[PDB]
A paper describes a structure:
Mitochondrial ATP synthases occupy the inner membranes of the organelle and form dimers via specific interactions in their membrane domains. Each monomeric unit in the dimeric bovine enzyme described here is an assembly of 28 polypeptide chains of 17 different kinds, organized into a spherical catalytic globular domain that extends from the inner mitochondrial membrane (IMM) into the mitochondrial matrix, attached to an intrinsic membrane domain by a central stalk and a peripheral stalk (PS).
As it rotates, the asymmetrical central stalk brings about structural changes in the three catalytic sites, found mainly in each of the three β-subunits, which alternate with three noncatalytic α-subunits in the spherical extrinsic domain. The inhibition of ATP hydrolysis in the isolated catalytic F1-domain arrests the rotary cycle at the catalytic dwell, and in structures of the inhibited bovine F1-IF1 complex, the rotary cycle has been arrested at 27° to 32° after the pause in the rotary cycle preceding the release of phosphate. In the current structure, the postphosphate release angles are 28.8°, 26.2°, and 25.5° in states 1 to 3, respectively. Therefore, the rotational angle in the F1-domain is not influenced significantly by interactions with the additional components of the intact enzyme that are absent from the isolated F1-domain. The PS is an essential component of the enzyme’s stator linking the α3β3-sphere of the F1-catalytic domain to the membrane-associated wedge and the adjacent a-subunit into the stator subcomplex against which the rotor turns. During catalysis, it prevents the dissociation of the α3β3-domain from the central stalk by clamping it in position from above, and it resists the rotational torque of the central stalk, preventing the α3β3-domain and the rest of the stator domain from following the direction of rotation. A cap provided by the N-terminal domain of the OSCP is linked to the N-terminal extensions of the three α-subunits and adjusts its connections in concert with the rocking of the α3β3-domain during a catalytic cycle.
Residue numbers in the entry:
A (entry chain C): 384 to 404, 410 to 508
B (entry chain A): 384 to 509
C (entry chain G): 1 to 272
D (entry chain J): 8 to 54
E (entry chain I): 1 to 47
F (entry chain D): 323 to 481
G (entry chain F), H (entry chain E): 323 to 479
I (entry chain H): 15 to 146
Amino acid sequence: KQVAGTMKLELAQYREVAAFALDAATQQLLSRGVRLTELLKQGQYSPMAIEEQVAVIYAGVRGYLDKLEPSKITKFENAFLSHVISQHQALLGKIRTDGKISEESDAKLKEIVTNFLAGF
Amino acid sequence: KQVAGTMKLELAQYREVAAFAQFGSDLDAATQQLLSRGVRLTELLKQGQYSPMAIEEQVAVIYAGVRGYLDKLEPSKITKFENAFLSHVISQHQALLGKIRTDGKISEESDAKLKEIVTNFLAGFE
Amino acid sequence: ATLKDITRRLKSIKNIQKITKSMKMVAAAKYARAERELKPARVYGVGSLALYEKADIKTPEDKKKHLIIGVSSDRGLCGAIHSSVAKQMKSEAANLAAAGKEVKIIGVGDKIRSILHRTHSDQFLVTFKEVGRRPPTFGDASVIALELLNSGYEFDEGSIIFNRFRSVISYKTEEKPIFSLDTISSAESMSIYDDIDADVLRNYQEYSLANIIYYSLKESTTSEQSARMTAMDNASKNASEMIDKLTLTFNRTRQAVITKELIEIISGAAAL
Amino acid sequence: VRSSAGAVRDAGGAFGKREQAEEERYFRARAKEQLAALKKHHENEIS
Amino acid sequence: VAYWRQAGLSYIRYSQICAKAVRDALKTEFKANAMKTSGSTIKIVKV
Amino acid sequence: DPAPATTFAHLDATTVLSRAIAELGIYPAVDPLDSTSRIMDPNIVGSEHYDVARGVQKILQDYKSLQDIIAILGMDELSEEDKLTVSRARKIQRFLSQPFQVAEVFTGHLGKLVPLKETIKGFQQILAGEYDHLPEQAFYMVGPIEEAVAKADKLAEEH
Amino acid sequence: DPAPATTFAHLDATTVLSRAIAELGIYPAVDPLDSTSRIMDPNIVGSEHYDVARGVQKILQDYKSLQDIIAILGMDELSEEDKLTVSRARKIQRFLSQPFQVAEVFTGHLGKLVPLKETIKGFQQILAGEYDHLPEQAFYMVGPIEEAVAKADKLAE
Amino acid sequence: DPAPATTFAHLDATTVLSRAIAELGIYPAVDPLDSTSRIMDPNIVGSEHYDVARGVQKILQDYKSLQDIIAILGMDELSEEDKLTVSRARKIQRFLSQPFQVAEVFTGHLGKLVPLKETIKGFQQILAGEYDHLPEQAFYMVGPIEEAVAKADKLAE
Amino acid sequence: QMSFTFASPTQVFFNSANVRQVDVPTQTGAFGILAAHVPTLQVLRPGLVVVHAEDGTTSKYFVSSGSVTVNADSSVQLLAEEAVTLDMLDLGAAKANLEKAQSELLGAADEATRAEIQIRIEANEALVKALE
């Protein structure tokens, strides 16, 4: 609920100014919209746990992926999970059990994403 | 008949160049005049509700409209002119209206009287 | 599609055709005015160029600093005007930088800037917009020349690319060399001209720069308006063909819908 | 069969979305400019 | 070297000033036509 | 359709909610040009209310007429007066949106009840030009006009 | 229609032949966007085959989206990325055309078979932009892509 | 629609009165170009009649095309082999109008029943250019061509 | 013989004409051009041009600025920036402008501003002198 709300607003704004393709503000708006769009894609018969979806969508919507190219986003997505699914099982268990991104959980998520982005 | 023939002709001319209305400027003088006259005439044909008009009133208003005596007024003001002007003739000049009504036509003397009335009222409106 | 899809599409295309006809008429009026104004400007600019073709000047072969100016406009819908101008501009810039030069670019009109903002994005000395809304004057050329001289990129050679207006249907892209006083002074031909210090000559160079900019502006606006008229004519013609096809489809669909509803009623009536 | 005003955006084809975006980008820019001016006026009128 | 060139100006500005000084002293009717075919409308975008 | 078409004749007031306006996010999606009322006469509501309503409807219809041109030219090529019509029309389009007390779950905002005089004042001012400097988004989902001013102030401060 | 619409649910692979495409001269007139298949799965065809097929479909869909504007406003009111998309999409449309042996009598051409690897490689090359200097009519009715290159060279003469 | 689609199968000709021509004061307001006939065939109406009709149709189409140029680029833009066609087409339009015997209370003239040979000769002469020196209004609402000559004499003298 | 060409940006007076004498005011002191004047290229100054037609007929146009090029083959290109015949000008207006410019002169925010202002004085003085 916390994360998808901001994602919904960002895609709603993006869809208005999408039919074309200047200024920094709207250029970054389009960038964020496209990043989220390529984030939402998925494969077949590989549903993701809700906490993993939250992690991916959080990384995408907190302006982290805005540096990456869009054609590469899928890579990140996949890779990111295969990292978090092994090293940071504890954080995902925390998010599932407590069912919210607490302040400490948010700070962790922040440091994990910041570290992973540079190392990739 | 006399006034409506000209009104209908001018409106027909205006309907085939109404597309340019948004542009308007950056076009010849003839189409400028057509647009102006058409807008004035359409603002003339506007009417209230449950406020019909006797034929003499209608002919007076359309006669004022179609002879250019409103080409100076701004369109937003026409619906006011039409109003105030009408009251004027309906109060000060009843003999001319009665002449037009009973006679049924606009005699040359009545045409001159309408010319003078329209010019005198328009000569001081604001 | 269904009948409502076809109806909405047909209405939209009819509106588009109306708008393109009106835009053709406006463009034609502006073209007539711009051609009328172009005659005197044609003679004036040709006279201002007179000198450089009367006393032939060969640009120095030991300098690297060059300027490319590209006259166009802000308005679109004018066909291959901005495209041709920017294409030749990048051709010249590539040739110069391959021969070893330090090229800059001045863009009179957004569309040139936009076409060249992906490549050559850093060579923009300065770009001007607000072109095309009203016919260009000598004020605009003076402003462009003034903001060129003030921006202290003392160039060693120049070129201006504009769309010379040939006929109502055709235009050509030109390149007119612009020289700096460093070249005019160091020319044997200029030895003859009398009372030619390096200050009157500098003022003359500034004025000739303004003159060539003005000439290019007038030619470019004339050709742009002609091209917009032609483009709007073609767009209206295409909208008319599409309207004909869609009207045929709409009639077929309307008849089919009538028949379908009627057959449904008949089947229900006979199935009691 | 006729045509009516505001039909290009009723179809919702390609011209409809193109027009919607052409409008939205322009008014986003103008909103940004007006917001900057509003902030400047705020600061200049604080005193 | 004119005085204005000692101030670092350029002959284009000199011509602008002289044009203003000559176009402001026309018969009142001529000023309406003189407003046309004069006066820039161009903008400059800082790069 | 025969059912709604027939139902139209049995009602005094109608408020034709429109999907083309709900897609834009204007909620309630009441179509201002396809809605009518019987009492909507100058002798029942008043001349100020009637004139404000008719001005709003006229400006929206003019906006619809302009949208066809903007699809070919672009906003950059409109007469500096037409851009004013478009700006007023968009401000009025947004200002008709309102947050309900029952739609808290969706929008998350808070419900507002706007007294009639405040609505008339808001639209009369928006038409008169007393707000042609505030951005459009300031008017989106707010009660009276002063709330739009406050929202614009907040937008500018966090600019 | 009820008959084809009902048949669609009884098939693994479809191949919607289209009259619009056949009027352009493309043959077989297969509509690349209506045609589908159950085995178009990266776990069955591969990752190069799947990626190439999806890239071709994406570019063709972008071209279809542009077509309505291209038809009226003309191909001049297009950004450079859009012009590149139009050119690539037309090259791909022509390249999907092939000369069958059973049509040797119709047209006098020579029938061609195109092994799967050659098809995938040719479309990879067209997609990457390796052949943006060729004329689009160099792909019209050819076997593998190298035949398209030979055709372009002959066109140069 | 099935009604006109079925009636048009039987028609052996067509006349198209147009509001756009009664405006010009031409009467009968028969659209010269939209009117059609099955027997407009050199084997039926004769080679001379067919050639005159085809020439008149071609010149009227030429004038229709030129009218766009006049409306846009202005009358000056014409050549001298096009201003001549404009003049000839205007004269032909005037000559195609006629005064009816049943409309003498609408035109003030006296109705004419022009035989066929008179019509063919009149239009042959106008097309040939034999009457390029006359004024256009000398052809308006007259019977045979000789009436146009007499009208020119009466209005010029 | 001369190939005169006197053309404002907006309107053109003489095109490839053949005149007799042309008295023009340039930055380096006014002077006159005849059939075979030595080639020059000067920059005009706010003055007036007197053209003597192929005979003894003379016409005066007030020029605000421009450039005069005298080429080897007796072709004169005299391009002004605002050449208006004298009859189109006003007298007292020039004096009013001159006096207002002088008044602003003392308000010299800096050197360049004064240069601008008393360029305006220069032009107005030329105007009054032409009309006086």
